[PDB]
Design a protein around this motif. Sequence first.
Motif, mmCIF file in Angstrom:
data_model
loop_
_atom_site.group_PDB
_atom_site.id
_atom_site.type_symbol
_atom_site.label_atom_id
_atom_site.label_comp_id
_atom_site.label_asym_id
_atom_site.label_seq_id
_atom_site.Cartn_x
_atom_site.Cartn_y
_atom_site.Cartn_z
ATOM 1 N N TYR A 22 30.145 3.219 -20.976
ATOM 2 C CA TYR A 22 29.405 2.306 -21.853
ATOM 3 C C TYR A 22 30.127 0.966 -22.103
ATOM 4 O O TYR A 22 29.642 0.142 -22.886
ATOM 5 C CB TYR A 22 29.085 2.996 -23.191
ATOM 6 C CG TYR A 22 27.893 3.934 -23.142
ATOM 7 C CD1 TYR A 22 27.884 5.045 -22.301
ATOM 8 C CD2 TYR A 22 26.777 3.720 -23.949
ATOM 9 C CE1 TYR A 22 26.800 5.907 -22.260
ATOM 10 C CE2 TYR A 22 25.688 4.577 -23.915
ATOM 11 C CZ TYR A 22 25.704 5.667 -23.070
ATOM 12 O OH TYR A 22 24.624 6.519 -23.035
ATOM 13 N N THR A 82 21.390 -5.627 -29.533
ATOM 14 C CA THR A 82 22.263 -4.455 -29.615
ATOM 15 C C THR A 82 23.738 -4.815 -29.437
ATOM 16 O O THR A 82 24.425 -4.226 -28.604
ATOM 17 C CB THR A 82 21.877 -3.400 -28.553
ATOM 18 O OG1 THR A 82 22.122 -3.917 -27.238
ATOM 19 C CG2 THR A 82 20.411 -3.013 -28.679
ATOM 20 N N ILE A 83 24.225 -5.780 -30.216
ATOM 21 C CA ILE A 83 25.648 -6.138 -30.183
ATOM 22 C C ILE A 83 26.301 -6.040 -31.557
ATOM 23 O O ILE A 83 25.620 -5.969 -32.583
ATOM 24 C CB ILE A 83 25.896 -7.546 -29.583
ATOM 25 C CG1 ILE A 83 25.238 -8.646 -30.424
ATOM 26 C CG2 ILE A 83 25.407 -7.599 -28.143
ATOM 27 C CD1 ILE A 83 25.813 -10.024 -30.171
ATOM 28 N N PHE A 84 27.631 -6.047 -31.551
ATOM 29 C CA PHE A 84 28.435 -5.971 -32.761
ATOM 30 C C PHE A 84 28.743 -7.374 -33.263
ATOM 31 O O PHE A 84 28.869 -8.310 -32.470
ATOM 32 C CB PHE A 84 29.765 -5.261 -32.482
ATOM 33 C CG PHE A 84 29.667 -3.763 -32.434
ATOM 34 C CD1 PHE A 84 29.433 -3.034 -33.591
ATOM 35 C CD2 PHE A 84 29.840 -3.078 -31.238
ATOM 36 C CE1 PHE A 84 29.352 -1.653 -33.555
ATOM 37 C CE2 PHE A 84 29.763 -1.696 -31.195
ATOM 38 C CZ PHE A 84 29.519 -0.982 -32.356
ATOM 39 N N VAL A 105 23.878 -1.917 -22.264
ATOM 40 C CA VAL A 105 24.374 -1.014 -23.307
ATOM 41 C C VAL A 105 25.577 -1.622 -24.023
ATOM 42 O O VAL A 105 26.322 -2.413 -23.437
ATOM 43 C CB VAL A 105 24.772 0.372 -22.737
ATOM 44 C CG1 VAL A 105 23.615 0.995 -21.971
ATOM 45 C CG2 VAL A 105 25.992 0.278 -21.829
ATOM 46 N N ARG A 106 25.757 -1.257 -25.292
ATOM 47 C CA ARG A 106 26.969 -1.610 -26.031
ATOM 48 C C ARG A 106 27.902 -0.403 -26.105
ATOM 49 O O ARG A 106 27.445 0.738 -26.014
ATOM 50 C CB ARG A 106 26.648 -2.112 -27.444
ATOM 51 C CG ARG A 106 25.921 -1.115 -28.333
ATOM 52 C CD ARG A 106 26.060 -1.449 -29.810
ATOM 53 N NE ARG A 106 25.373 -0.461 -30.644
ATOM 54 C CZ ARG A 106 25.855 0.739 -30.969
ATOM 55 N NH1 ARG A 106 27.051 1.140 -30.543
ATOM 56 N NH2 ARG A 106 25.129 1.550 -31.731
ATOM 57 N N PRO A 107 29.214 -0.647 -26.271
ATOM 58 C CA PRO A 107 30.162 0.460 -26.413
ATOM 59 C C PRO A 107 29.906 1.312 -27.656
ATOM 60 O O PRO A 107 29.273 0.851 -28.609
ATOM 61 C CB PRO A 107 31.518 -0.245 -26.537
ATOM 62 C CG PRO A 107 31.318 -1.585 -25.926
ATOM 63 C CD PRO A 107 29.899 -1.952 -26.236
ATOM 64 N N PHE A 108 30.401 2.546 -27.633
ATOM 65 C CA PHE A 108 30.317 3.427 -28.792
ATOM 66 C C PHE A 108 31.248 2.921 -29.883
ATOM 67 O O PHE A 108 32.419 2.646 -29.623
ATOM 68 C CB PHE A 108 30.705 4.858 -28.418
ATOM 69 C CG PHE A 108 29.663 5.581 -27.616
ATOM 70 C CD1 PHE A 108 28.589 6.194 -28.245
ATOM 71 C CD2 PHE A 108 29.758 5.657 -26.234
ATOM 72 C CE1 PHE A 108 27.625 6.865 -27.511
ATOM 73 C CE2 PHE A 108 28.798 6.327 -25.493
ATOM 74 C CZ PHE A 108 27.730 6.932 -26.133
ATOM 75 N N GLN A 149 21.629 0.746 -29.453
ATOM 76 C CA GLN A 149 22.702 0.812 -28.454
ATOM 77 C C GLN A 149 22.290 0.304 -27.069
ATOM 78 O O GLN A 149 23.122 -0.243 -26.348
ATOM 79 C CB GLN A 149 23.258 2.237 -28.346
ATOM 80 C CG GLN A 149 24.481 2.347 -27.443
ATOM 81 C CD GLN A 149 25.339 3.574 -27.713
ATOM 82 O OE1 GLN A 149 26.567 3.493 -27.698
ATOM 83 N NE2 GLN A 149 24.702 4.716 -27.952
ATOM 84 N N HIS A 150 21.024 0.486 -26.694
ATOM 85 C CA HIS A 150 20.550 0.057 -25.377
ATOM 86 C C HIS A 150 19.093 -0.395 -25.382
ATOM 87 O O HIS A 150 18.347 -0.096 -26.311
ATOM 88 C CB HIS A 150 20.738 1.182 -24.353
ATOM 89 C CG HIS A 150 20.181 2.500 -24.789
ATOM 90 N ND1 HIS A 150 18.842 2.813 -24.691
ATOM 91 C CD2 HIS A 150 20.784 3.588 -25.322
ATOM 92 C CE1 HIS A 150 18.645 4.037 -25.148
ATOM 93 N NE2 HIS A 150 19.807 4.530 -25.536
ATOM 94 N N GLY A 151 18.709 -1.123 -24.334
ATOM 95 C CA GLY A 151 17.319 -1.532 -24.122
ATOM 96 C C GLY A 151 16.994 -2.972 -24.483
ATOM 97 O O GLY A 151 15.980 -3.508 -24.033
#
Lengths: 235, 243, 240, 244, 231, 241, 111, 195, 250
Positions: free
Chosen positions: C118, D10-12, C124-127, D123-125
């Motif tokens: 990931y 879907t990012i931090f 996808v973003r990391p866990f 988280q994804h998509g």
Amino acid sequence: DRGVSTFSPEGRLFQVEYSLEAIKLGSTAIGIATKEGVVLGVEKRATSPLLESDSIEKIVEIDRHIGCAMSGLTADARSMIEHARTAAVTHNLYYDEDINVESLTQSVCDLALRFGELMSRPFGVALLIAGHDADDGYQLFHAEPSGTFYRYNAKAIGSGSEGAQAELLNEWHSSLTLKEAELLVLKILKQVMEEKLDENNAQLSCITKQDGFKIYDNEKTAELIKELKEKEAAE
Amino acid sequence: TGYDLSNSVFSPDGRNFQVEYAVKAVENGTTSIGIKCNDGVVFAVEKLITSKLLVPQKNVKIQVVDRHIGCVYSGLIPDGRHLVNRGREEAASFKKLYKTPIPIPAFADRLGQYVQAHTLYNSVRPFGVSTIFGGVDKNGAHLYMLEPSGSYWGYKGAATGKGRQSAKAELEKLVDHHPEGLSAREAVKQAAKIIYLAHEDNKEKDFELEISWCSLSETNGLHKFVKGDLLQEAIDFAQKEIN
Amino acid sequence: GYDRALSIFSPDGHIFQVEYALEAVKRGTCAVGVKGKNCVVLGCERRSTLKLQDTRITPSKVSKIDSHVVLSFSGLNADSRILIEKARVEAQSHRLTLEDPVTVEYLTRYVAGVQQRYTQSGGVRPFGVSTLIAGFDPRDDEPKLYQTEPSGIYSSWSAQTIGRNSKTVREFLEKNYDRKEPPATVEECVKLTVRSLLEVVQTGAKNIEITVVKPDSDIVALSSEEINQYVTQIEQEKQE
Amino acid sequence: GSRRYDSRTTIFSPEGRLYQVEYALESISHAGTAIGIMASDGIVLAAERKVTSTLLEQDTSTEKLYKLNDKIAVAVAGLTADAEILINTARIHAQNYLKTYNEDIPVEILVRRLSDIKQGYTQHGGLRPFGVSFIYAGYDDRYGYQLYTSNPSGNYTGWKAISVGANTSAAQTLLQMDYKDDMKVDDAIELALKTLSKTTDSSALTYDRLEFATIRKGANDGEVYQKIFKPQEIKDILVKTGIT
Amino acid sequence: NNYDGDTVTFSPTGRLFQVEYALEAIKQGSVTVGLRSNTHAVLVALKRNADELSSYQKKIIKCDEHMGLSLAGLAPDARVLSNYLRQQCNYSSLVFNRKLAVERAGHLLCDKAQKNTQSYGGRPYGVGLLIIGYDKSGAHLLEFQPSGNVTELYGTAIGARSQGAKTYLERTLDTFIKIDGNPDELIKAGVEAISQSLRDESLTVDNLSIAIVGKDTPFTIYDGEAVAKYI
Amino acid sequence: GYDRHITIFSPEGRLYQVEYAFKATNQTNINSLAVRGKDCTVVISQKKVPDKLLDPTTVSYIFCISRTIGMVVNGPIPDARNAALRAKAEAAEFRYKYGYDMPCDVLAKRMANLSQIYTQRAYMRPLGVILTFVSVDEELGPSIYKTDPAGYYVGYKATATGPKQQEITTNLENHFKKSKIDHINEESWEKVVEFAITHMIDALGTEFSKNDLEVGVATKDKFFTLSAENIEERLVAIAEQ
Amino acid sequence: QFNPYGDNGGTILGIAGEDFAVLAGDTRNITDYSINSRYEPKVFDCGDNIVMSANGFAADGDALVKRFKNSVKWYHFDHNDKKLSINSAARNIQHLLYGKRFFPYYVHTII
Amino acid sequence: MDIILGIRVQDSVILASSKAVTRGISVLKDSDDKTRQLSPHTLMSFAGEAGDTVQFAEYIQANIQLYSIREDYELSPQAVSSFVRQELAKSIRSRRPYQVNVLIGGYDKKKNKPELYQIDYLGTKVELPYGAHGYSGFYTFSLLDHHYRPDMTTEEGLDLLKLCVQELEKRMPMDFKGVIVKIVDKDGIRQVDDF
Amino acid sequence: MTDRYSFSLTTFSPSGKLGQIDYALTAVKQGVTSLGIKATNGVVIATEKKSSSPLAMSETLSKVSLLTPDIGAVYSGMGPDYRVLVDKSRKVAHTSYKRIYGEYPPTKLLVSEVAKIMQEATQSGGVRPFGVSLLIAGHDEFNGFSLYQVDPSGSYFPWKATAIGKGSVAAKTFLEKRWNDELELEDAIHIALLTLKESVEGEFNGDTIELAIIGDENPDLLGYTGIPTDKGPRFRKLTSQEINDRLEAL
Ligand SMILES: [Cl-]
């Protein structure tokens, strides 16, 4: 932002160049090739004293005749090693023989540029691939995330690389014994490492035609460390 | 602003700046022309001799599609080759299904729709070429010129590249002086003259002339390159007119 | 399919999305792992800004991956469920093909591999999770404790902590844990784990969870009173 | 290309937070308050409709309280359209379980799967998350009466009493004050209505701005009944507790 | 500036900056020379090392018995393109029992490079190639640029300081073109050509790389002690 | 301000890319006009051939979509031909699937739906064209239906499109105020073409030669375009009255 | 029904000495009771001092030889012109043959 | 494969399964255990096509064990039997169906009752006091119709089972090499070693 | 090529707003006024026919559309968006209901399906939301008559009476004064015409107004006889003449 496979105005791929900076932050790994064998040594660099250092696995077997050391984002190496092992075993299945060290290295390097918008980014780890085959004998290769690999008589990668490489330039000659190479890796690792070198924070390994790839015990390396300190004091 | 940073985006004028920017790449290229004649068409192009080391006659720029159509272009040469490769696929599938070789107007729209499709999305770049092409079909001779936008028309004479204005002026004189028509062999000679006259706008490097033609009587309706005696005769005619 | 490369290198050679995922771990509740001579103990902080909770049904912080291995974590709770599910599926898949349960090292290596994937997959973003994985290999009495993190690196630890104020409890464990003599009994190991959490937690009431894993699939979770006895005993020895 | 227009949902953040989840929670904080209270002999669901118009058809309306199966219901806070997408998925999931095992789905299993779907969108998509928070009220023969909540992050937790939507901070303090474990359903009904009445942004709490439901074992012997309250029944229960 | 983010964007003057930046990677590459007569074609390449402990990066690759190339720029991109050429040469042999014309080889490389300059997500190839070969129409030399432009020449050079060799070959044109039926002399001319691109360094035994193909000579590469003859 | 680059809403609920596609419509600087007779539908458009090197016969903005349907375009020729090819394919498929000729209004709706999709989907730009479809429908009779980049469409008694469209529109309005009917009360299509040219001359204030115009005529069971000499014959008839 | 196989007859023979090996085969090619050719060779030099014959259905035989010859060519390209040993050739040919396990090459092969 | 039997009594379910594995004219093994424990209180026996039987049994075992770990809970025998039925019902319309017949013996801890389910390869499920797959049923069903009572003890059930094995050993054509007997009750699953 | 826009174009802003939905509602505000009123024995939906040109034939442009024989729809906002929604709505009534149950869907469920379609344009990749608000009136056996509003977000609400678009604020206030629970269908039509006159500026007749009802079954509009259970559509579009008749006794 910008494309992942974008060229800079100087004709270099941004992401490949940036991954090279990640490798400079990695722990030191040194390889020396002789006519008696190839030695691979690494700095373990435990982040905390509570961490059990023998679980740090930065030297790795690919096949009986090929070994590998790593530096940088070491988690990225797992799939590279997995590919290398499969490539090695698959070639033995298809051809009933050992695969050439150069052919193995080329196969690993084919993964490197398979990124873009294939994986999302280049690998953040450099590999030292050491082995023996009947055609070209003992060989050491430096595999980069650019997809490029150079054969080396000796090579250092990681944070202490440019200082260690300059040292390897002076010390290496075409008649080094295996024992001489072992001590030389320990000597140069002790120079560039932050913490004091011992058997728990550094690891040695070698590949010989006769016995294949072997990672040394902490007891065996400890004696080579003691042999090294005594020889430097002896003049 | 920023309207010019992405293909297929309309500016407040109603323009696609990325296509207009592709036109600049065409204007930078070497001169190429097309002359329609009595029973066919003639194509010619300027090949800049960058160095002595270029092998003469061996970097061919005019391209054949099927056996009856000729194509020449100015601008990004690779882009032109991509368009001809598509043209050959289009012509092959037409002949496969309908038996008869593709008519020139039919072929013109196939290229047109394909080039126009590269102005519809931001994930592709417009073509960096204007393409002059044509040949002979069941209804006689046809000459076309296709631009980066996908725009094309039928032409009596056509020109594109760095010396397009010089060539256009020279083309207009032929249309005025020959209302009844120009012969195939005459058009070959005139094509040589016009390329030499259009070379004045690119006169640092000297050049190599390349001509091709399709004619119902002279080439039996098939595309052929002009070589040897007929080429040298056309070169000499052009050399006499500049002096 | 959504393809964007979200985890990419920056000019200085950092992957910011992986590093920002570590910040999510730093925000999470503290988790600690300590292994003794014959056991491993997993301790977990539970924040007390949530009263009116139902502790019967609320997801527990320590999860059984198989009957002999457990997994705790720090970071995004929703993210951890995905890792736990995949780990549990791999555990059964391993038993099916190898006819032997996973080693703790193997299970850790799998979970760490998922986390790494990931970090260089498109879209996808990391866990936002770091895990502590503890247990005993089949037919083995040697305690095992491993740690993983968003980047995908993993390693073995005699004792380790993750989450908020983990640097404080790591400090405590670094001077209070003797490698030459690990906590010889279950009681000693639980106490050292509870002591380490009491450096950071607040009250030793319903804020600390303790799970003890012993050899041959012997896992049990301590109740409030059992843990409270350790809290009461430690404070009385402190006033000295 | 299209990279230019990608918001990257879907990012931090540099602080380790998920932008879109945080902003979805901000959206939900403006939605009508919904309260769940779990008693020993049943569960209460109470929710405030978003500023009503007098010409709205109140009886044939559903905005806040939805039925997932005969044993489980949800209270909604956020975008209704988003919630219905998830509700239909949850309804299908319950039937899949019943078809597979010939047993009604345990509440937590349904809650986990719906929460896992929400997690995926973070988280994804590259899609925006669902701007919805649920209060799950249900019964099964393992844990009996259960209250859960889930939010756009896909995180879920169990509760004795809980509120979602607007004024949760004030609502939770009031619930924390008057709630006790040996409470009965009829007491919980009163607590729910009293809390909404004090936290409401309206002038006065009336029957036409409320949805109400109970999940009791107040059927006949060892079985559970879902009661979605009719307009007149809410009017009566509001008088019975002396709010109007 | 604002128009160099990807290959799919034209600048206001009609330039493709990503293609131009790819072209720049060739200029940083080590010099390589190509030249031919009527009977033979010769490649000469200056190899580059990382340091004195490393090997010298191989510049020349064999594509078929009658064809091969030399590279300047990104070496992995040369590996991809050479592999494609190996397959195309091979397809021609298996399907048509026909050796691939060096001209078609050039057309195929042009079209493969072009597709990477018109689509989003991709990047141009970052390497230049000099292809030599002997086919049914005699000896040939091609110059490949990753813009897509392929050019047939009597002689040429690409890489850093390639202008020196390119000027020399332009002067020597009338001499070396008529070196027919003499391999060693055609190589000597190529070794003298690449010498016009040297600065502070000279041609050593593990530094020089030579390749030759011709009428009665399969494409073969010379390294190590086999090039000592020419220093 | 990336809301002006793709087809998403601006703060004021507008789609700027659609609006800018409307401005591309007039890029050719050509005006078109359509009217209905009793038995026919006539469409006329200006024909400007500036370059002397052009083959004038190939310069056209009127298209024969099917045997019965004709279409004139206001906008750049690449987008015009894109629309024409799709319309031809759609009309052909309709006949194959449903066993009867596609009506003018149904084709107009279909092309309008396709245009609507480009206003909602981001990866596809709108076509910078306005499409005027004409026929003599077997059910509805003489028909004019027009499509734009917004995906809007409607039937017309008569219509005009181009830079000087408003002048032509009011000119036609004033005639139908006077005549009190929905069409040109004329037997032959020849005189309906004459009416169309006459009222375009009055509205634009310009005279036309045979090469300045382009004429399409729809009758029962066929749509056809006129040659230069057919138009010249028509111009002579107007002048001699 | 179409039968994708045929029988082209002929026979082959291999013998090994101390420092040499022979591979022999007749040059007759047949179908049913007719002769197709009196001289159609089916023993081939494949490079690297390996000779090969795939006898039975000639179309499959030619296809296999063609694929192995190609395999030798790519072995050089991929492994620095290394000589393909006879044991490695043998193993490679096994994979060529077994790759069509469910639609076999109808030949007896000798190298 | 061949003989699998099941008897549900007052407080337990007893499964008996033949020990022979025969291929051609050779008995390859005489100690084969044709059963898998799906959960602590659920046992499944199986018979049918070679390979398919064990592959299916272990696949079901893995799924039930996965469920157990996920929920920290044991599925009821009824729930497990329904899951197994659905898998076989899917299988029968696949490209290659599982040719496996099963018996599921379980003790429901919530109900404090033994339960026996008979499921064939088509996905045909029935709950029964006693069950059999294959040719065994042609002898045992009538025998059990006569001697079975619903209130029997585990010991009485074992004697009733001995009577079935004796009848099969007398009248069946093939040597099935005896049976392995297992009991499922409130305390879980255990094997009778001397039968 | 290919749709590279696989990401959401509508996203949450820091304040919690969904920008594109808000802007879609702004487009609806600019749109021409439409309304719906529910009576005891029927429902009426109405709107102004804003003509783009006097040369345009406004009969060819239908703002009020039949979805099923017992359900009709009207809108405010962007016409093209509405047109394609009517196409999709008509199809989904068949594919996800009639082809399964052999009967037409009840109003609430068809509304639910349209709402789903509009919600997906708010979350799916590479699309903007629909720039329309719908008013859907209908009848079914077990729910009787109903009236629903569907917004760009995908939210829907049942109404006794309401208005959307240009002058909706004033029109809603007008309807509050006039609406009671005893209104007969003819009384609702009368109020609909009164309410609409306030928002209409120019001509106010049967050619500039579009109006349809959901009321009694129309056997004359069925097209066949012989099946007793089939009694005809409850949806009927009022003719230009029928509107003018009611505008005299206004
Ligand atoms: Cl459509």
